[PDB]
């Protein structure tokens, strides 16, 4: 299964190391951005389903699910939202200019809290506060399952997915956490971050935890 490679729009590349190369204190904000994005994609499929009810049948349950994979130093965040086709992944996650990218960077220079990233419509890129590599695994009703992958350099890849679990519909954000941000694999830390910043979310937030039988 052959990967295709794409270049990021210049300012997005600039943003990603303005982010991956911050001191910044309040790195936990990366999870509120993901949950907020997940909730929007779930909004979209629900809104779409108003006039096309069958769109929901590929995955009738509407949820956000967080799954630590400590052996792999990975945190996953799944939603059963609208998903992205191959062309959406390429268009929406890097090739096309985002309206607020340059404005956000300008605001950051002037002293804005990184927390405002969401208000500039580029909150997706905050994942690079905690992760040096990411896969977005996504299944839209309108396409096959694909994997988009980035290590914050100037190119990303998109590959037809023949290696991951089948998602009915929606997206898995798969974060390869930095060796110093491994706290985010912990059940108590996750819970704490969710209650602080994601209080008004209309969908269940599920946490998957593994325990030894004693």
Which residues are annotated as part of the binding site? Answer: 33, 37, 79, 84, 92, 98-100, 119-124, 171
Binding residue (CB under 6 A) for ligand ADP from 104, 124, 146, 184: 124
The span from the CA of 133 to the CA of 184, in Å, is 15
**String of contacts with ligand ADP for each residue 57-96, x by CB under 6 A:** ----------------------x-xxxx-------xx---
Can you give the binding site for a copy of itself, defined by CB under 8 A?
A: 42, 46, 50-51, 62, 116, 118-119, 200-203
Helical ranges in the chain per DSSP H:
10-20, 29-49, 86-90, 101-110, 187-197
Which lies closer to a copy of itself via its Cβ, residue 200 or residue 213?
Answer: 200
- Residues of 165-195 as b/e, b for ≥16 C-beta within 10 angstroms? eebebbbbbbbbbbeebeebbeeeebeebbe
Using a 10 angstrom Cβ sphere, with 0-12 exposed, 13-18 middle and 19 or more buried, the burial of residue 81 is: buried
Binding residue (CB under 6 A) for ligand ADP from 16, 108, 122, 137: 122
Interface ranges with ligand ADP (CB under 6 A): 37-38, 40-41, 79, 81-84, 92-93, 121-124, 171
């Amino acid at each position: 299964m052959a990967s295709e490679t794409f270049e990021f729009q210049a300012e997005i590349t600039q943003l990603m190391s303005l982010i991956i190369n911050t001191v910044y204190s309040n790195k936990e904000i990366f999870l509120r951005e993901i949950v907020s994005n997940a909730s929007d994609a779930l909004d979209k499929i629900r809104y779409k389903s108003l006039s096309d009810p069958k769109q929901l049948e590929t995955e009738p349950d509407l949820f956000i699910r967080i799954t630590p994979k400590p052996e792999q130093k990975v945190l996953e965040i799944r939603d059963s939202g609208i998903g992205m086709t191959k062309a959406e992944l390429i268009n929406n996650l890097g090739t096309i200019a985002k309206s607020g990218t340059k404005a956000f960077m300008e605001a950051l220079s002037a002293g804005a809290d990184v927390s405002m990233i969401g208000q500039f419509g580029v909150g997706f890129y905050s994942l690079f506060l905690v992760a040096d590599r990411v896969q977005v695994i996504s299944k839209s009703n309108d396409d096959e399952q694909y994997i988009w992958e980035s290590n914050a350099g100037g190119s990303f890849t998109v590959t037809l997915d023949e290696v991951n679990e089948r998602i009915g519909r929606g997206t898995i954000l798969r974060l390869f956490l930095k060796d110093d941000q491994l706290e985010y694999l912990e059940e108590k830390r996750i819970k704490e971050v969710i209650k602080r910043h994601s209080e008004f979310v209309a969908y269940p937030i599920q946490l998957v935890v593994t325990k030894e039988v004693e």
